[PDB]
Design an enzyme around this catalytic site. Structure first.
Site, PDB file in Angstrom:
ATOM      1  N   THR A 132      25.572  33.748  -3.595  1.00 48.20           N
ATOM      2  CA  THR A 132      25.952  33.441  -2.185  1.00 48.20           C
ATOM      3  C   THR A 132      26.982  32.330  -2.143  1.00 48.20           C
ATOM      4  OG1 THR A 132      23.826  33.986  -1.115  1.00 48.20           O
ATOM      5  CG2 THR A 132      25.209  32.317  -0.046  1.00 48.20           C
ATOM      6  N   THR A 133      27.868  32.383  -1.154  1.00 47.17           N
ATOM      7  CA  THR A 133      28.830  31.311  -0.956  1.00 47.17           C
ATOM      8  C   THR A 133      29.104  31.186   0.542  1.00 47.17           C
ATOM      9  OG1 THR A 133      29.930  31.646  -3.115  1.00 47.17           O
ATOM     10  CG2 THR A 133      31.052  30.257  -1.525  1.00 47.17           C
ATOM     11  N   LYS A 160      24.944  35.479   7.077  1.00 42.84           N
ATOM     12  CA  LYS A 160      24.517  34.165   6.625  1.00 42.84           C
ATOM     13  C   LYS A 160      24.978  33.020   7.517  1.00 42.84           C
ATOM     14  CE  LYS A 160      24.717  36.014   1.931  1.00 42.84           C
ATOM     15  NZ  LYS A 160      25.205  35.864   0.530  1.00 42.84           N
ATOM     16  N   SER A 174      25.613  29.652  -4.911  1.00 41.62           N
ATOM     17  CA  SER A 174      25.964  29.879  -6.306  1.00 41.62           C
ATOM     18  C   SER A 174      27.459  29.854  -6.601  1.00 41.62           C
ATOM     19  CB  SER A 174      25.395  31.221  -6.760  1.00 41.62           C
ATOM     20  OG  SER A 174      25.809  32.248  -5.887  1.00 41.62           O
TER      21      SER A 174
END
Lengths: 224, 219, 219, 219, 219, 224, 224, 219, 224
Positions: A1-2, A33, A141
């Protein structure tokens, strides 16, 4: 995820990827998100989706509940302190592997410099909260790569259009080096999502604008 | 025994008749709240949830208490399920249950009268709904208008006669303002708000001075 | 001492006699509920479980409370065992126990009267059963009809005379509607429903306007 | 102080004298229960345990409550030890203790009177035993018969004279039915059951219509 | 204030004077219990521990309750220490403490009077001891005899005159039986038992019919 | 241990062995593993005898208590749900080695097809309950062998006499391959026990019938 | 185990296999894994049968209880949030090996596009809930294979008959590669079960239709 | 019932009218507190938070108690959120809730009257706000001045006439001091403080002798 | 330790050794392991003496307490169920090494066959209770040897004198193969203890009879 957060002339923005993985296996291609938490704030979350999505949901409810009871919305700092409290309340789960970490942004109505009312606040797993003030920040991550890309392509006090482009690009670079992030899927027409907050409030960037920005970065890179 | 509840009932009734009045009615855009209140800091009308509104008369500290409980109750149900599962009828029933228990067990009954207003969803053609809950746990559903506080009889009949469906915002305000004058004053010094169905999510909206200026008819 | 219960009893009786009436009866298809109620939002009749129905008169907030408790009680027993182990007699006994305790320990007795109706299973040739529970915990089983609320005597005798077994739906409705007129109005403005035994599982069903139109005889 | 218990006692006594009667007696096969009860759904007589029977008069919801407690108490003792360790005397003492406490501490005494009947084991030559517990915790042991409910005096004396040991089932029923007629009706519309000692384990048995037909003498 | 305890005291006194009597006395073999009781199922005399006996008058359910507490108390002390550490004085003090608290805090005082008797160990030359505890927590030690229940004065004086040390079992029984006749009947229909010091451990023993026959003098 | 359940024309039955072992050592030769739980139901138990026997005893009490309180017996399904609850309440002990697993049979009074009112319900250690409907089932260490034998010698809708014989035979085959089950002891005259349930209720098979059935299977096998 | 969910023109469906294994051993051949949870919704469950079946049962009760108390059924999203809460309440057991994961489908009465009112929601072991919107989804040990089969044979907005066939086929492919799923048993006439939900409500597919669909897939495969 | 609250109300009113007075008003720099208090150790005026001030009349131990609760409440809210989220309205509502509950449930109502004053932030052009909470939970917002304690009527009217917006510190003090003289003494022996808006954070400040000297006008 | 129980014409008996060891070291030479629990019952205990002796003591008190309160003694089965409850209540301690196991005997007043009113009940560490009915039984470290000796020298329905002799002999054989049991000490005049229960009640065998029986067995063995 970013998830990335950027400051610009008008206000602030948040953008995040759409991937979810269970180990190496891809479990989702359309995860949301980034959420608008209230008129002048939004938050992105990384970590155990189970807990994260409902946590940011509760946060939104709590902010609106405060306003309906007091007749006045909370200070931006007050909103940040509340999120911290919720993160702190999850320390137990975090210590068992179910950790979640949010990234909060907002247009500070009580800010002096109205061109710099945009703010970014990052969090700890223990509930700590931190003012970013570097222009941008990221979590997840792939954050390491997104931040290093932004360190080169980010321009302070740029306009919204410029900031949005740098954001999708940093997310592109993140998916390029982190298999857990996942870039634009021109095959299914699925792209990162974003929210921009300014004097006028928090708005969801149209998927037509995200689509356009994605196609552009892909083309700039495809062009060797 | 039967005299206890007799007295308890009178204490509440008198306390309410001693206060000012409020008019809640159904019109073209949704629901309108017109309450007599000189203060702009302390309210008698408030948003409950997305499509719910609250209005009360009587002792302030007591209905302000019930107002908060209602917000807590609504927010919680919305979170446990979905925002769209939060209904006006559900809150009304809760207030009825609560006031009923207070009237029977508490040292003093609540000198309060409450109204819960609900408007349909953005698209829905559903007609707004109103509920009125009294100090003893009584509850009634009204589909046109509700009057409470002070001497109601004169204000009620006035409304009963000047009420018409699909009223314009300006008309509806007039209807209420004039009906309020049949009691006993009544200038642009009152609390007004609406439950605007055209709105996407949060339908509650208050109407400030300047905007209220051009709605309240002269005498 | 004996006077306390004397007064408590009167408070409840009067409160109930002051309200409207309800008629519950046994016919060809199962059980019919005919209750005087101008509202379509607040009910006095409701489904309890698969083959159980509920009807009450008196103070709303109080019997609505007992209505929910009954649903909770039924659903729970069905889950702990089997749906088919949930009996009307079991709920009736529970209400009796509950009301009896309230009449003795609570600050004010419940101004309520309740009826639990049960119909047999789809196949079963078993005749429907009715139970009536009063504010002091008294309970009686009726196999033909039950009348409660307001001034019953005139409505009861009327029913006592116009009642016949195996009545048609339209006939049964007439019997009840006419008996209701012997009290004191009584238009297609009342709450009606049935416990249709022909149904597979959930036997409770309400009868709306249009369908009610062609059942309620003129005067 | 002494007047409180005076009144409490009267409330109970009157409430019981206001209800119907019940006769419990000892005969050739064990114990016979003959109770005045028009209903076939709600009972006043019931099995307690293997060799124990229960009968009560007064307010239903209250003795039904004590009936269940008794079953709970008996089943539990049998499980903690052995079924054969469950005695009639033990339950009688428990009821006495319970009713005594209620008469002193509860808001209202229980308008109830209870009888516990025990028959010997299959082989045992032991003569059946009866216990009577009243609303104030009083308890007495009777070895021939017990009468309770309504106006007892006339029914008692009748029994006192028409009672004989080793009575036939048909005779015993007559003795009771006729004694019941000396009160104040009394057709094959009453609750009857026996504690048949000849049975292996569970001695309690109810006597239905057809079988009761040929036992209840005409007037 | 002082009147409360005045009335509470009268309620208890009258209730006890309304019941039958009991005589407890010291003789050659240890202690003798002679109580007026028509029943053979419900007792007023009982063993407490190895060398302790219990006798009471008044309301049954209440002293039966105190009888059990006493057994619990004795058994427990014997276990925590040694059987020989269980003393009559210890139990008497406990009853005094208990009855005293009930007389002051409970809704109704206990209409009871209790006697605890203790005999020495097998060898010991120690003379038996008697304790009497009343409804208000009063306690006295008697070394010859105790009379309680009904109208005591006449029975007491009788005993006071016909009492002699080292009485034979038959003599002691006569002394008590005749003294009981000075009250107000009194046939071989009463409860009798002794605390036989000659016994190794458990000194309590009841005296049945046949054996009682040849002890109770004719009138 | 091996407990078997069989369905037949009239109703259902349960039969179980008599052995108890503590490791390799034999601890009992006359254990009763089948109990009538009420007029129309019975249950067999495998596992820690300490807990098992008193559990099935409590079950019986609970069923009769329900009937005395409600004046009506429970549905067969209701009886099964209650047993499940009791098994579930032993999960703790089971996780420490004191597990018990029952096998429930009954003549369903509320059954449509009166010739197929016989039912068999097996359980989980977690409290799960399962309808068998294969004609037979078994539990215990020797269940594997008993089921494989029944798969060959069982006849659907057979009469009682036939079902009883197949049952004792499956138990015989179980004791033949599982030392923890134990077959007929013609030396002490101790044989498996059984219960049959039909329209008339649950009855204990006489030890003369079990003795006879045992002698027969032994003779059929002894005859090479 | 394998449970599949498919979206189609009319509404949505659920289909599941019938096998239960204890390690390598087969413990059941007729497990019901799909339940109608209310008029317009159904759910399938994978995991510890003990817990799963009674959990989905409680879910059904809870939904009906809400309706009887409020006089109005819950929103589809509301039903999903409630299931999540129940899954979340089992986290404890899941961490000890007794995990259960449901798959929820329903015809959204409050849906705009009435031809796309069919919805699929998958869950987490921590209580997370996820909108599928890919047309299909699956859960259980064989889900991987079923999804890969569907990725090739599934047709969006197909009719009911077509969707039902693709579902039984995906389940067939699952049993073909996962011994824990188990395909059609033409020997005992036992086949996967299914439920379809449309404007008219949730209905149990007849075992004659399942039998027919099974025979067909088997024939298509047997034909090399 | 209604008489209870009648008496409770009088006890409080009289107790307050028996004490000294206090005047709170709005002026050029923010808010001014002028209270009659001979002591310099025990206060009636105090800081609440950054921009909030507190003043009370009545029974000391009781309002000192409410003063502390207020500080606790404010400090806590500021910590949970941000200092700037702490509002005067929020504290006022809390006091109203608290006093209301005490007036209804406590053995004796609080003989107190409280005023909460709030001034805007350093830059903000927002006009100061005042709230007054009474012993029964009543609460009102005043934007000019508040008078409480002793006989208010004469002091109120005086203020009502001598009040002017944007008053100088010296002028404002005079206005209050003279108005205080219209009651019933009143030398430089009183408690004075201000809520100085010019201050960065903590706006509360007390005015000592020497400085007060040159502000209090002679008579 | 070794405690043996034997059934005979008149009633039942219990006999136990006198040794206590702490590892290999001998800690006691006169332990009393058999207690009269009431008029018609007695119990022997093996295991942690600390807990055992006071447990059997509490049992005795509980039985007499019941009788004094109810005016009637408990059934033999009732007495056995109570002991079970007490053993069950020690499971905790047992799992930490402080286990105790009793052996209960009694003359059943409610028994039909008055010549067979003698009963023997053995227990589990989990509280289970078991009817013996083999004529004898034993508990403790040497029980294995005592039972195997009894299997050869025991005579059903023998008289008291014969039963007592077989009992002391089985205990002798136990001490002969189990150093933790310990036989007759002719040096200090210390011998096993015993209790006999019959129609007349439970009586303590005189140490003169035990002495006599011991001397006899020793002589029979010494005589090669």
């Amino acid at each position: 995820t970013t998830i990335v957060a950027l400051t610009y002339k008008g206000g602030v923005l948040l953008a995040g990827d759409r991937r979810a993985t269970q180990g190496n296996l891809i479990a989702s291609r359309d995860v949301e998100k980034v959420y608008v938490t209230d008129e002048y704030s939004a938050a992105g979350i990384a970590g155990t989706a189970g807990i994260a999505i409902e946590l940011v949901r509760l946060f939104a409810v709590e902010l609106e509940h405060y306003e309906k009871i007091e007749g006045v919305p909370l200070t931006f700092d007050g909103k940040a302190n509340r999120l911290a409290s919720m993160v702190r309340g999850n320390l137990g789960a975090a210590m068992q592997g179910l950790a979640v970490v949010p990234l909060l942004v907002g247009y500070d109505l009580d800010a002096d410099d109205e061109s710099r009312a945009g703010r970014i606040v990052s969090y700890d797993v223990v509930g700590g909260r931190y003012e970013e003030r570097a222009g941008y920040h990221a979590v997840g991550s792939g954050s390491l790569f997104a931040k290093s890309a932004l360190k080169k392509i980010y321009s302070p006090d740029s306009d919204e259009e410029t900031a949005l482009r740098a954001a999708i690009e940093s997310l592109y670079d993140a998916a390029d080096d982190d298999s857990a992030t996942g870039g634009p899927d021109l095959t299914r027409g699925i792209y990162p999502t974003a929210v921009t907050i300014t004097q006028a409030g928090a708005v969801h960037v149209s998927e037509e604008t995200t689509s356009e920005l994605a196609r552009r970065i892909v083309a700039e890179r495809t062009e060797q | 025994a039967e005299q206890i509840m007799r007295d308890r009932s009178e204490l509440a009734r008198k306390g309410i008749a001693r206060g000012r009045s409020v008019v809640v009615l159904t019109f073209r855009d949704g629901v309108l709240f017109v309450a007599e209140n000189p203060s702009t800091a302390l309210h008698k009308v408030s948003e409950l949830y997305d499509r719910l509104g609250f209005a009360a008369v009587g002792k302030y500290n007591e209905f302000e208490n019930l107002r908060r409980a209602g917000i807590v109750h609504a927010d919680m149900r919305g979170y446990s399920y979905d925002r769209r599962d939060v209904t006006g009828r559900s809150l009304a029933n809760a207030y009825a249950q609560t006031l009923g228990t207070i009237f029977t067990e508490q040292p003093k009954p609540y000198e309060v009268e409450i109204c819960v207003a609900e408007v349909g969803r953005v698209g829905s053609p559903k007609a707004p709904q109103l509920y009125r809950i009294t100090y003893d746990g009584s509850i009634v559903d009204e589909q046109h208008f509700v009057v409470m506080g002070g001497t109601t009889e004169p204000i009620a009949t006035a409304m009963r006669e000047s009420y018409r469906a699909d009223l314009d915002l300006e008309a509806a305000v007039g209807i209420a303002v004039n009906a309020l004058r049949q009691g006993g004053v009544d200038v642009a010094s009152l609390e007004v708000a609406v439950l605007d169905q055209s709105r996407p999510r949060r339908a509650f909206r208050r109407i400030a001075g300047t905007a209220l200026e051009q709605l309240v008819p002269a005498e």
